[PDB]
Design an enzyme around this catalytic site. Structure first.
Site, PDB file in Angstrom:
ATOM      1  N   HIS A   1      39.734  79.964 104.637  1.00 23.42           N
ATOM      2  CA  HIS A   1      40.040  80.775 103.467  1.00 23.42           C
ATOM      3  C   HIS A   1      40.545  82.167 103.835  1.00 23.42           C
ATOM      4  CE1 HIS A   1      35.939  81.612 104.633  1.00 23.42           C
ATOM      5  NE2 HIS A   1      35.969  82.738 103.940  1.00 23.42           N
TER       6      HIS A   1
ATOM      7  N   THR B   1      45.955  83.688 103.762  1.00 23.10           N
ATOM      8  CA  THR B   1      46.981  83.635 104.790  1.00 23.10           C
ATOM      9  C   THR B   1      46.541  83.552 106.245  1.00 23.10           C
ATOM     10  OG1 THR B   1      47.107  86.042 104.714  1.00 23.10           O
ATOM     11  CG2 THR B   1      48.583  84.812 103.253  1.00 23.10           C
ATOM     12  N   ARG B   2      47.439  83.034 107.074  1.00 24.31           N
ATOM     13  CA  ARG B   2      47.193  82.874 108.499  1.00 24.31           C
ATOM     14  C   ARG B   2      48.489  83.140 109.257  1.00 24.31           C
ATOM     15  NH1 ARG B   2      42.847  82.943 107.104  1.00 24.31           N
ATOM     16  NH2 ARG B   2      40.934  81.782 107.659  1.00 24.31           N
TER      17      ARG B   2
ATOM     18  N   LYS C   1      46.640  92.998 104.486  1.00 26.57           N
ATOM     19  CA  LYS C   1      45.377  92.410 104.915  1.00 26.57           C
ATOM     20  C   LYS C   1      45.208  92.716 106.392  1.00 26.57           C
ATOM     21  CE  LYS C   1      44.471  88.021 105.869  1.00 26.57           C
ATOM     22  NZ  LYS C   1      44.302  86.540 105.760  1.00 26.57           N
TER      23      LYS C   1
ATOM     24  N   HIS D   1      39.830  91.291 115.401  1.00 31.70           N
ATOM     25  CA  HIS D   1      39.555  90.074 116.168  1.00 31.70           C
ATOM     26  C   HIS D   1      38.461  90.156 117.226  1.00 31.70           C
ATOM     27  CE1 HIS D   1      40.812  86.031 117.454  1.00 31.70           C
ATOM     28  NE2 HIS D   1      40.486  86.443 118.666  1.00 31.70           N
TER      29      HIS D   1
ATOM     30  N   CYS E   1      34.632  85.196 106.977  1.00 35.51           N
ATOM     31  CA  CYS E   1      34.988  83.892 107.498  1.00 35.51           C
ATOM     32  C   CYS E   1      34.412  83.728 108.907  1.00 35.51           C
ATOM     33  CB  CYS E   1      36.517  83.782 107.406  1.00 35.51           C
ATOM     34  SG  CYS E   1      37.408  82.730 108.580  1.00 35.51           S
TER      35      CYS E   1
ATOM     36  N   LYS F   1      47.264  77.991 112.970  1.00 34.82           N
ATOM     37  CA  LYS F   1      48.696  77.787 113.150  1.00 34.82           C
ATOM     38  C   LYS F   1      49.009  76.436 113.791  1.00 34.82           C
ATOM     39  CE  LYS F   1      48.719  81.447 115.776  1.00 34.82           C
ATOM     40  NZ  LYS F   1      47.295  81.545 116.229  1.00 34.82           N
TER      41      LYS F   1
END
Ligand SMILES: *Cc1cc2c(cc1C)nc1c(=O)[nH]c(=O)nc-1n2C[C@H](O)[C@H](O)[C@H](O)COP(=O)(O)OP(=O)(O)OC[C@H]1O[C@@H](n2cnc3c(N)ncnc32)[C@H](O)[C@@H]1O
Ligand SMILES: [Cl-]
Ligand SMILES: [Cl-]
Length: 387
Positions: free
Chosen positions: A45, A48-49, A265, A269, A315, A348
């Protein structure tokens, strides 16, 4: 009472793609999920990715990246759901001080990928809204971009179901019973059997793979992202602000241009709280790091996007020790395929992995080269829970 050709446990990013590939071939498939994909309890969720081709995590991912891109374009033509937008992807960092940037450039050169190379003020000049030091350099990939992840899973599901695939939702698989010539799953809603099993439970792989006598280090991480009110004349996809993944002194950050005014957004990481998918707190803001780590980035590199927090999402990543995926057959069961530990960068590749998983389940082999994702590789630290 009913058997299937193949059973996919965990119909998420990887599982739903596999379901589509299997059904597409008339293979009677059953996909079982604890929820109703796409949902907000797993790792797909957030709308976007990013998809990159020149791969900084390792140039060996390029082929799978390229096949996946072709598959995303194919999905775009097959459904009414929006799948991909070519925002391009910008990668930058301190000159000579970013392994990620270096490997990206090397990956580009090695596979003859189309990219732009620029440094310092040339970055600021080209993209109003981005402010980096003169010592920073960058590599821009015009043809990669952004995938609408929830739409992808939704499309693959609708397509697979239309082709005969069955999807059992809100049904958590609680145990496995594997045999020489068949596989079986236990759930509160009943037991199911098949000839082949694909296991792709995301963050839950770290907890349930032991049920398959597999002892592999997999650590789930709580990873948040925030949507910020931004200067649309600079950060909108409409004015070509790109998606990005960069490495600064304190780590790696990734972001997306504002789509239809949703705001830029941004996600951090490098850092995340170690958690358990069953007890993780999915509310954004419960940890001071959630919003502070993001604004610290924005104020320094993209000041015009450091406005009000419009939305926050929580997430999960599921990391392996070497941060490379696990895609292979169960060491002791050739009729069992495992897809785990995508370490925060596997969406991806979900289209391509769907294909790989399909091939492994049906033939026990794949045309793709997946040696680096071997479940027996030493860097993984894999072993059986009791041989
Ligand atoms: C979290 C995250 C990840 C991420 C990202 C940003 C954030 C905040 N940005 C990415 C990006 O820009 N580019 C990219 O390539 N990847 C990016 N990622 C990583 C990617 O999202 C993950 O690698 C990917 O989603 C991994 O997919 P996987 O299929 O492993 O995980 P899932 O989609 O969560 O699906 C698992 C499903 O299985 C079900 N489940 C779990 N346990 C059970 C049981 N016991 N029984 C039945 N089903 C089960 C879940 O419900 C889930 O649907
Ligand atoms: Cl996200
Ligand atoms: Cl992940």
């Amino acid at each position: 009472s009913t058997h299937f050709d193949v059973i996919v446990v965990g119909a998420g990013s990887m599982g739903m793609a596999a379901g589509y590939q299997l059904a597409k071939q008339g293979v009677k498939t059953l996909l079982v999920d604890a929820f109703d994909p796409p949902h907000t309890n797993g790792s797909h969720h957030g709308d976007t990715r990013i998809i990159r081709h020149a791969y900084g995590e390792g140039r060996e991912y390029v082929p799978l990246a390229l096949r996946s891109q072709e598959l995303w374009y194919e999905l775009e033509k097959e459904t009414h759901h929006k799948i991909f937008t070519k925002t391009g992807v910008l990668v930058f960092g301190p000159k000579g001080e970013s392994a990620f940037v270096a490997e990206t450039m090397e990956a580009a050169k090695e596979h003859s990928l189309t990219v732009d190379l620029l440094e310092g003020d040339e970055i600021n000049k080209r993209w109003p809204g981005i402010t980096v030091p003169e010592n920073y350099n960058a590599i821009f990939e015009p043809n990669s971009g952004v995938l609408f992840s929830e739409n992808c899973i939704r499309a693959y599901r609708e397509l697979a179901e239309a082709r005969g695939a069955k999807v059992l939702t809100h049904t958590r698989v609680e145990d496995f019973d594997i045999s020489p010539d068949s596989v079986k799953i236990e759930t509160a809603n009943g037991s199911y059997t098949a000839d082949k099993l694909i296991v792709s439970m995301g963050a839950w792989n770290s907890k349930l793979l032991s049920k398959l006598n597999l002892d592999i280090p997999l650590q789930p991480y709580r990873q948040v992202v925030g949507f910020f009110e931004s200067d649309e004349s600079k950060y909108s996809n409409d004015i070509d602000f790109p998606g990005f993944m960069v490495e600064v002194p304190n780590g790696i950050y990734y972001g997306f241009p504002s789509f239809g005014g949703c705001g830029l957004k941004l996600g951090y990481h490098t850092f995340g709280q170690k958690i358990d998918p069953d007890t993780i707190n999915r509310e954004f803001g419960v940890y001071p790091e959630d919003e502070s780590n993001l604004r610290a980035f924005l104020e320094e590199y993209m000041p015009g996007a450091n406005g009000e927090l419009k939305r926050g999402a929580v997430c999960m990543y599921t990391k392996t020790l070497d941060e490379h995926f696990i895609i292979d057959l169960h060491p002791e069961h050739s009729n069992v395929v495992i897809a785990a530990g995508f370490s925060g960068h596997g969406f991806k590749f979900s289209s391509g992995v769907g294909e790989v998983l399909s091939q492994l389940a049906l033939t026990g082999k794949t045309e793709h080269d997946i040696s680096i994702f071997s479940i027996n590789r030493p860097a993984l630290k894999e072993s059986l829970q009791k041989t």
